[PDB]
Amino acid sequence: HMTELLKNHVAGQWIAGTGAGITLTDPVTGVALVRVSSEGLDLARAFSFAREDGGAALRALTYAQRAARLADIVKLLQAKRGDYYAIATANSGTTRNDSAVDIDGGIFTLSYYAKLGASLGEVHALRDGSAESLSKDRSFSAQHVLSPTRGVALFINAFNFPSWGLWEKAAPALLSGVPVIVKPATATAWLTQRMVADVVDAGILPPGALSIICGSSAGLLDQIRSFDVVSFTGSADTAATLRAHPAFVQRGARLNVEADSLNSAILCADATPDTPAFDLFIKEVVREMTVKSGQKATAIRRAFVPEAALEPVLEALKAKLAKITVGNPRNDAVRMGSLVSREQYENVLAGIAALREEAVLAYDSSAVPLIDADANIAACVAPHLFVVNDPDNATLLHDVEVFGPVASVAPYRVTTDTLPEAHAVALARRGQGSLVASIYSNDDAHLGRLALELADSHGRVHAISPSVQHSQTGHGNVMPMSLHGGPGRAGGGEELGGLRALAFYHRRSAIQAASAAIGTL
Template sequence: MSEILKNYVGGEWIAGRGDGTPLRDPVTGEELARVSSEGLDLDKAFDFARTKGGTALRDRTYAERAALLGDVAKALQAKRDDYYAISIANSGTTKADSGMDIEGAIFTLSYYAKLGASLGDAKVLLDGDVTSLSKDGSFRAQHILTPTRGLALFINAFNFPAWGLWEKAAPALLSGVPVIIKPATATAWLTQRMVADVIAAGVLPEGALSVVCGSAAGLLDRVQAFDVVSFTGSADTAAKLRAHPAFVSRAARLNIEADSLNSALLGLDASPGSGAFDGFISEVAREMTIKSGQKCTAIRRAFVPAAHFDAAAEALRAKLAKITVGNPRNETVRMGSLVSRDQHTSVKAGIDALRRETELLFDGSATPLVDADPEVSACVAPHLLGLRDGEASAVHDVEVFGPVATLIAYRDEAHAIDLARRGGGSLVASVFSDDEGQLAHFAVALADTHGRVHAVSPAVAKTQTGHGNVMPQSLHGGPGRAGGGEELGGLRALNFYHRRAAIQAPSGALDLLPKAAAK
């Protein structure tokens, strides 16, 4: 039996009891490690984080906490090679795909370190302008934001074990809120290792960062009114979380990022051979295959004018035919595996469900896997499906979390917008057009049902950041089935970890608020 990875709680490294749950290489099936949270003293762990970690963080200014983030980023940079090796082994991703997770994590930390430094020596944030409450202006109101006196519990998904931790932890720690991270079991090794390296570097105060590997049982039972919880995962699990007494009775804050049937839309003006058409094709193919389609922002539905359906199908087939699938250790492989055989089964079932309503435009499984046994590995080749009228229901309801997308024809602008909205709320939609007026029109029309609209013209073909790339400067989240949550977005991310209060006082007292908060 392989080693059981230890949990870090209450300022100690503790191995859970029992045999634990194995973590495997999704290409070879080899057991890599085990995790267990059985027997942990969760009451002690939560209390230690709130009191020891929270107090130490709140005693620092925003600029001082920003410096801590910079030190965390440096500690992680020194161990990059180790993280790539773990990612390739435990997630089955190519080096390039692993980089999206690892480098994205370090970039986000560095961004918030720089952003936090601009907040200076304050310990609270002023929110908006002073408002007069009296005719003579002597009695006024000022809203302020103070760090919540609780902890942040993160329950994360398997697809981004590095970035998924630090994109949440960076604004939490900058806000002065300690973090307990519960990574998805299947890929917990990378998260646990990063936490271990940061703890070993001694760059954070005791209790500021904890990790629980294994079962999440009992975690929500310890969540109190001033704690906050951020969840990334399925809509079914999110629904169960919402019903927990921590949120129903104790009114703790809950942020959710769930399922998302993201779209890419080709404008009516973008005919085959145009810059917008070529950009659309490249982006759809890229989003289908990067991280084997295991991204919450990946393109699942690609809308094209009906007149260009066959041309788009042929162009995508040509792109996808060049994708080699298999063992990411082989340098010829462009796309690695899914994260586990369970996901392999789920994706295959999802493809079958979509095929009942669609035609199969491209089936990459006709090409043999590279250095991978199809009976053992979790590799699934790209599948492109087609729908010529857009009126089927499954493509707007079933998210297949793998290298799968459906090309869908639309009649006119109103039809395209209606089809995109049928996703029920999504993280992101992309629009490709040569006409910037059309880009603006689609962007506004889609904004109410999407957390982000990514509009691309040929003028920004080389500078646009990518449909699926989540940048810390912009909002990450979406309404409806996407969870209704918000993350990142620059300083907006700090709102989740702060409490807003209105201070009603004489003008002189309001002027002294920053000084009072510094004590």
Template sequence: MTELLPNYAAGRWQHGTGPGTALRDPVLGTALVRVDAAGLDLAEAFAFARDTGGAALRAATYRERAAMLMAVVKVLQSHRDSYYEIATANAGTVKNDSAVDIDGAIFTLGQYARWGDALGDVRALRDGGAVKLGKETVFQSQHLQVPRQGVALFINAFNFPAWGLWEKAAPALLSGMPVIVKPATATAWLTQRMVQDVVDAGVLPVGALSVIAGSSAGLMDQLQPFDVVSFTGSAETAGVIRGHPAVAQRSVRANIEADSLNSALLLPGEAPGSEAFHLLVREVVREMTVKSGQKCTAIRRILVPAEVYDAAAEAIGAKLAGITVGNPRNDSVRMGSLVSRAQLASAREGLATLLAHATVLYDGRNQPLVDADPAVAACMGPVLLGARDADAAQPVHDVEVFGPVATLLPYRDSAHAIALAQRGQGSLVTSLYGNDEAALAHTALAVAASHGRVHVVTPDVAQAHSGHGNVMPMSQHGGPGRAGGGAELGGLRALDFYHQRSAVQASPAVLAALGVPDLA
């Protein structure tokens, strides 16, 4: 029988008491390890994190906690090769896709360590300047940000087992909040191993970081008023979390990242063969195939002027034809597998829904797999769909296929293009492609209210831009409406979720004695 991975809770490693769930290689189908959380004393785990881990973190200054983050960076860097091996085996990703997850996580941690060091040796942050409360200056109000005295529960998605943990844990730990992470079962091995390496290295206070790899049953029940929960996953599960008594009655702070039908928009006037046209095609193919399209920020809808629809279909299809799919251990493979056969079935089901309202422009489903058995491997070649009547094809604006699938949609004019982008009912990101700075700026402002991030690509940034789907810690990650209404990262803005804002009303002398810096 395969190894049963231990959970780390209440300051000690613990095995679940059940048989566990096997994690499998999505290409070879072999069982790798098992995870189980049955029988854990969750009340003890949460209380220990709050009382022991939280107290130790809050006793440190921001600069001292930043040093802890940098120590975590060094631990992860020292084990980096083993993380790549786990990602290949458990997530079916090629090396470049594993880097997005693993190296992206390490980069984000390092960035927050540097930002935190600049905050200095203080334990609270000033939020804005003091303002007088009357005609005289003798009595003023000063807003502060102080660490919340609770625990941060992360319920994470399967697609980013490394980055999904650390992009949330970095600002939480820097803020002084202990973390309990519940990774998605299918790819929990990498998250569990990273936590194990950090715990064994002793670079964080005991109780500051815990992992529960198994069922999420009972976790929400443990949340108390000063705790926070951050969830990444389906809109259906997000609804359950929002309706849970912890959130609905105890006012636990909740951050949600859910479904997102992101778009890429080629501005009017960009003819086939133009640089902007080429940049759109390149980015669409990249976003369809990186991590086999299993990214919450991936391009799902491609909006182009009606007159270039056929040329765009041909150009995107030609590049997709060069994508080899199969076993990521083979160096010739460009795209690995989905994370499981269950996820493959889900992607196929979503694709079938879209096919009732769209036509296939490029079909990679029947191409031969490299070193992989199609009866076993969770592999799926990229599929480009098209709908000439973008208004009538409602499901393409409603259904997110979490795999290598995108739909090409023509628009009549700028107003129509903006309206189609907004049909996503709230998205994480849209990207704009063109040369006209004024038109790009106008469009960016028009779509900003329905998107968490607007990524503008012009020929002069062709080699410099960070990518439509690449989430950088300097920019906000999140989006309104369907995307969940949450917000992560965005530099030090991320700390706000883990702090309590409080107004201290006092004399200038007392306010000066607080001795806290601005939250820049």
């Protein structure tokens, strides 16, 4: 009586919501951690203060001056990592290595943009492309520019990456001079709020540049105006509710959606059991099923393998999944901790029961005793591997996402005329647009060709082969220099991609003028 109620940071001040708030709990032990509440906040003043005071203050700084602030945030978060790992263990139930993906993946992405931003220099707008003549005598020309939007960036973030979900978006928004309002998902909000508190307490950014609201979302979209941008990460259903709001349909504010995705892994026809690419496929499937207990939007959900390879693949995945120990991440023998909440436990188990209506369960370690955890309290789900023998007539295989340590293997028919993986491509496309597909072969040139065939349906194609066993950055790990997003079911969004992320935060304009006026910006 009672755990800490975490304050919101709005209009440059720390303000508590009213009422009892919503308790965040440890998903292994059931302990009450902290509470949130957005009840009673003055949302009009929160958004106006950020839009006017925050934006004016950030726009007065150059890109390089904002990058320097980002670099100062890096050093701050680096110094406080021990506090962040203790929050992540308790609130998210992740192993240290899995919590590093959030915490140190966040810090690495912020540092990447601090470095990119230093290169942009001491200016207040960016050139887009080169100058172009608009006249035979070259007296009149055009230059396109990017200028920071006179709005706010509202981030409605998913539960699985409280730190990286914040920094992957906030690094390009703040480098672009746009003030940020983050709204983390309630169940795991604590790390987000503590990182925002540490950065606000250090006074590195101007008042109004960084705000946080935790608790109910009611009322937030009603404050969004036509120069604002919104970045939503979460379910496709929720996204479709947000898309209908007047902020987007009437006022035209920008929206980015990152949603559900049934990411594929395709084992190439050449990559037979006696070849090194085969073991890289089994290892990457097990890693993407088990890191964060499969709670990445980019995890492999569908693995397509030649018909001839079906049994050796199932045998090899079963042997490797059996080495994944499950339980309390405080125990150094545990390889995989819990899902983020008991509610997500129930949702994952429903989703496993749903898939089992159409697929055979090949591997399920649910009966292996948990390590230092009570299965009636903890939100630990064991790996489950499904096999779908006829993926062409399968419904659920290509439609139903289980956001847990769950994946389905299906065979495809190798094409033996003139790509051998043509059927696998078609099957991946049945996912109706995904964030990522990975492909595995012993032949690097072949992978460049197959990748082009998956590019129109996947925001990223990730090719693993023996030459890069040591250097490939992971199927599900999002490198900030690369695009993150995908068409169709994955939301039609784009994030990251290095400098490509700044466009969402800017307004592009064609300036057409005397050529002298053009030369000097």
